[PDB]
Amino acid sequence: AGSLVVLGSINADHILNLQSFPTPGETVTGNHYQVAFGGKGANQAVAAGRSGANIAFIACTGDDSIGESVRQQLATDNIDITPVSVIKGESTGVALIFVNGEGENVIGIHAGANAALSPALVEAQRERIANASALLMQLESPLESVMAAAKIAHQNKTIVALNPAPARELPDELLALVDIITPNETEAEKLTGIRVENDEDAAKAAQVLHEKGIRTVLITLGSRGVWASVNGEGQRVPGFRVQAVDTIAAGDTFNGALITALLEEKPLPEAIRFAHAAAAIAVTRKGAQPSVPWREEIDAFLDRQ
Amino acid sequence: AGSLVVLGSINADHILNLQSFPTPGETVTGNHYQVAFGGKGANQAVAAGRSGANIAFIACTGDDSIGESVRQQLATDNIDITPVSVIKGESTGVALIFVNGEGENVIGIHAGANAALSPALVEAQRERIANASALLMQLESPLESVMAAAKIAHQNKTIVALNPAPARELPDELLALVDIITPNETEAEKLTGIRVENDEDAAKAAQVLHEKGIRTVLITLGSRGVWASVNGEGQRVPGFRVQAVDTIAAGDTFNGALITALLEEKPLPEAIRFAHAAAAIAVTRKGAQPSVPWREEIDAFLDRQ
Numbered sequence: 001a002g003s004l005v006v007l008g009s010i011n012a013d014h015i016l017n018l019q020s021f022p023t024p025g026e027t028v029t030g031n032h033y034q035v036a037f038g039g040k041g042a043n044q045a046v047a048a049g050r051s052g053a054n055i056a057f058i059a060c061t062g063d064d065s066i067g068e069s070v071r072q073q074l075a076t077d078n079i080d081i082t083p084v085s086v087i088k089g090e091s092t093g094v095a096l097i098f099v100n101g102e103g104e105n106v107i108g109i110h111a112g113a114n115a116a117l118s119p120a121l122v123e124a125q126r127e128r129i130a131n132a133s134a135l136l137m138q139l140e141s142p143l144e145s146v147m148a149a150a151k152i153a154h155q156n157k158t159i160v161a162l163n164p165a166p167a168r169e170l171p172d173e174l175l176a177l178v179d180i181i182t183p184n185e186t187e188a189e190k191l192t193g194i195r196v197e198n199d200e201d202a203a204k205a206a207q208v209l210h211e212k213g214i215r216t217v218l219i220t221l222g223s224r225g226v227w228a229s230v231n232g233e234g235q236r237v238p239g240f241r242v243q244a245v246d247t248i249a250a251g252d253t254f255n256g257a258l259i260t261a262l263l264e265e266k267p268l269p270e271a272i273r274f275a276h277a278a279a280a281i282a283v284t285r286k287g288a289q290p291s292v293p294w295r296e297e298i299d300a301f302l303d304r305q
Numbered sequence: 306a307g308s309l310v311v312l313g314s315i316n317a318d319h320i321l322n323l324q325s326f327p328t329p330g331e332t333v334t335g336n337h338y339q340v341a342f343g344g345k346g347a348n349q350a351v352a353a354g355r356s357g358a359n360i361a362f363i364a365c366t367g368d369d370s371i372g373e374s375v376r377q378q379l380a381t382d383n384i385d386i387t388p389v390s391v392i393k394g395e396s397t398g399v400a401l402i403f404v405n406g407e408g409e410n411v412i413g414i415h416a417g418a419n420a421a422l423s424p425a426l427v428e429a430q431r432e433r434i435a436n437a438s439a440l441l442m443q444l445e446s447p448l449e450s451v452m453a454a455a456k457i458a459h460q461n462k463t464i465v466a467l468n469p470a471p472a473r474e475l476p477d478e479l480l481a482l483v484d485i486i487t488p489n490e491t492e493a494e495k496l497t498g499i500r501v502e503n504d505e506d507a508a509k510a511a512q513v514l515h516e517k518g519i520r521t522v523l524i525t526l527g528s529r530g531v532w533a534s535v536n537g538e539g540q541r542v543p544g545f546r547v548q549a550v551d552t553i554a555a556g557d558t559f560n561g562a563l564i565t566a567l568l569e570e571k572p573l574p575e576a577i578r579f580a581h582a583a584a585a586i587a588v589t590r591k592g593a594q595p596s597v598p599w600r601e602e603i604d605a606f607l608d609r610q
């Protein structure tokens with residue numbers, strides 16, 4: 001399997017379980033409270049590394065205590081943490097999260113040191129990006145830096161995979177550089193104009209992304225699995241019906257695991273299956289990163305399926 | 306002015322400013338992020354102490370670093386922190402807060418060590434409560450402990466003031482022990498059954514609380530000020546139209562400042578005016594506790610009014 005470069009955020013997640021999300025001006029008393037490692041970059045890097053990829057992670061942490069001890073934690077998840085830089089005089093990105101009784105979540109992030117991952121730090125990782133087979137990125141890092149890395153990857157034939165989350169509009173210059181894009185429906189709407197309630201809407205939205213230059217488009221459809229479209233021809237690949245308890249890092253786990261299977265030369269339908277299996281384990285557990293499965297558990301899940 | 310005993314929560318507030326509250330399953334990027342001292346007990350204790358009361362505070366902190374340094378901070382706000390206990394092996398209550406662009410907030414709390422403020426710790430403060438002129442409490446402390454303290458106060462003729470927040474139903478045994486109650490409209494609905502959209506609804510709701518044994522009922526009506534009802538006869542006392550930016554601790558500041566004026570023998574209408582002035586300063590500033598005004602600023606605000 002070739003090498004994977006993940007580039008994205010690292011956060012300290014502050015998670016509170018409650019019955020129901022507080023409404024404006026209301027104070028709710030929750031139950032469980034947890035401070036754990038998260039971030040869309042870290043979560044995908046962990047999911048890639050635990051499922052078996054040969055992955056290196058480009059990220060910025062602050063020099064607080066949490067920043068200084070997340071690198072050590074990430075190194076045990078089978079991730080080369082050499083390109084994780086420690087920004088002096090800055091704190092680690094933070095996430096404040098509410099997880100309700102039905103298991104949905106609401107998330108508010110504060111960039112912190114994730115904002116210091118710049119085009120200069122990306123430009124120092126040119127060779128790593130150039131030699132990699134894939135580059136996986138999200139939108140919790142500065143847009144300039146996602147654009148700079150996509151550019152180096154594009155020149156050097158490194159697959160560029162982008163999980164466009166959280167939702168935002170992206171300029172065509174970035175979109176043209178992407179090979180694999182994995183939006184959810186809110187995100188596919190925000191990038192193309194097309195609301196996505198079904199497979200016809202999904203095929204509509206995918207065609208706009210094919211129009212922008214993106215060959216492989218995967219639109220996740222919540223409980224309905226994913227709309228997989230490779231330059232036009234597209235179909236639905238359902239996930240595993242499972243008992244959701246904590247749906248945080250489900251998307252992240254799917255993206256990291258997805259790229260691992262593709263770097264092991266698994267056809268796309270099979271890479272999606274494998275990723276769906278990692279996500280299905282992840283959501284039956286709590287917290288972002290802690291719910292991420294190792295390769296032997298993904299296999300076992302698949303063997304019984 | 307006689308002595309005030311405040312009994313209630315101490316929290317570490319984790320506050321993120323954002324445009325708009327995240328909706329289910331959506332991740333939002335906020336701007337400012339702050340970790341500060343809060344808790345309905347601490348906020349009211351600070352508002353009482355800074356505005357001039359002779360106040361002592363019964364509360365439990367954990368032995369984390371934040372717990373160990375909030376006592377020292379509270380001692381500078383003119384508060385006797387002797388009855389603030391440090392619970393070994395426990396963390397300080399936490400609050401996770403979103404503050405939107407219009408300045409409203411959504412709050413989710415985790416009890417922590419606030420749950421260890423028990424009837425035994427209350428029973429050890431019997432003499433302090435018995436000798437005080439007023440006892441101010443909220444609902445972020447165990448209901449048993451609010452009930453135990455109300456009982457000692459009632460026996461010894463200490464005014465019992467209760468800010469029934471966050472909203473919950475209360476048993477008649479507690480209600481019968483209260484002299485002054487300060488619900489907001491959600492809270493007045495939850496205690497009596499009566500939704501409160503206006504002064505007629507407010508007078509309806511107040512009559513139920515008068516029915517339960519509570520002589521002085523103050524129903525805050527958001528921007529419309531407060532419905533003041535002393536055993537029936539009731540009227541509206543408007544607040545100061547001001548430019549809200551951070552409405553957190555506005556209620557708390559009003560309650561603490563309210564009790565200070567009453568302990569200085571100011572008639573109720575005038576105590577409300579003074580409290581309204583402390584709240585009006587508080588909301589033009591950010592964070593719970595940090596936005597709380599000192600006595601000279603309340604006076605100055607009143608002098609120009």
Ligand SMILES: OC[C@H]1O[C@H](O)[C@H](O)[C@@H]1O
Binds near residue numbers: 009140
């Ligand atoms: O995607 C899950 C992650 O999004 C936010 O970035 C949180 O930090 C959380 O860990």
Ligand SMILES: OC[C@H]1O[C@H](O)[C@H](O)[C@@H]1O
Binds near residue numbers: 314342345400553594
């Ligand atoms: O009332 C304001 C307070 O309520 C919650 O208890 C937060 O900690 C905040 O400081």
